[PDB]
Design a protein around this ligand. Sequence first.
Ligand SMILES: CC1(C)S[C@H]2CS[C@H](CS)N2[C@@H]1C(=O)O
Ligand SMILES: [Zn+2]
Ligand SMILES: [Zn+2]
Length: 219
Amino acid sequence: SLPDLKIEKLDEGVYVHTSFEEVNGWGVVPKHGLVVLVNAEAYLIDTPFTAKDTEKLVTWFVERGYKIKGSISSHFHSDSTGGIEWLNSRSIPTYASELTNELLKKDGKVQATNSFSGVNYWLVKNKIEVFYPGPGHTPDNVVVWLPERKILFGGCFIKPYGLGNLGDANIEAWPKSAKLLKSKYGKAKLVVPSHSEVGDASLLKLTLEQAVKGLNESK
Ligand SMILES: CC1(C)S[C@H]2CS[C@H](CS)N2[C@@H]1C(=O)O
Ligand SMILES: [Zn+2]
Ligand SMILES: [Zn+2]
């Protein structure tokens, strides 16, 4: 059936987790998120699709001696938030922007217990930053920046070979948001997309190019 949850070291104290789902109309979708280690503590950057894999992801780090201090969801879709309910049931703090929690509530989905609003937010000061470049893939999508490793988790915003499903997208705003994102993190050493392979800062340019190309054809 579906492939198993995967966990791979990317850099010191930085892991990529990859989960898999059948999405009607698209087949098997891979989803990359991160687990970031601060000392003996771990932060989930997005949850896997399901409580099952969220649980597997968590026990993997706990069994290796890391306390799960919290999770942050980069946007409201299931591939970033699907594990929030299970995490909440274990009293592991969950984080999302006000807009994300609003979009979850509208959909009748479980909200993160902690919310933030504003362009920038430190989940962990000087270690894990959250940035809102504007609407793109969804109205609420944010990225997560690791200044010590110069690693950017781009989430589902980063779409280098095509925009994917535009159901909740803001096609007008996406080029402007992508330009802002490129401005801010052009010096990223690594960029981690949700649905494609890890690349360098060039993925920011391609995303902008795909966004611009996507808008013109819309007209
Ligand atoms: C374009 C897709 C295959 S369809 C959509 C469902 S979940 C995930 C985005 S959140 N997704 C795929 C994608 O964007 O790669
Ligand atoms: Zn999405
Ligand atoms: Zn996604």
